[PDB]
């Protein structure tokens, strides 16, 4: 049966090694999300504190 | 009823590797089992 258990390790080991490389590029795909909503809330402030300004004006 | 050798299973084994080294001392110290080279082309610094 040994062969049968190598089968099933093979078949486990293939799928952790999908499952790491997934998150890898998710970590990736997270990382431009996290650029991109940083820009914009960083424009958000600049809204805001541009309209501090009109008012102090 | 002649005396004849014992029966052989050429039997394989898995097992994780820190449940191994522990396993390979007990098994040892029981001294009735007999391992087998699954990397006969591999030296030492291979084997790690």
Known sequence: ?57 | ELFRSEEMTLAQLFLQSEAAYCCVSELEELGKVQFRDLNPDVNVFQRK
């Open chain 1, 1 to 57: 049966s040994q062969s049968q258990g190598i089968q099933q390790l093979l078949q486990a080991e293939k799928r952790a090694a999908e499952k790491v490389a997934d998150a890898r590029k998710r970590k990736a795909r997270r990382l431009k999300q996290a650029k991109e909503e940083a820009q914009m809330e960083v424009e958000q402030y600049r809204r805001e504190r541009e309209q501090e300004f009109q008012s102090k004006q």
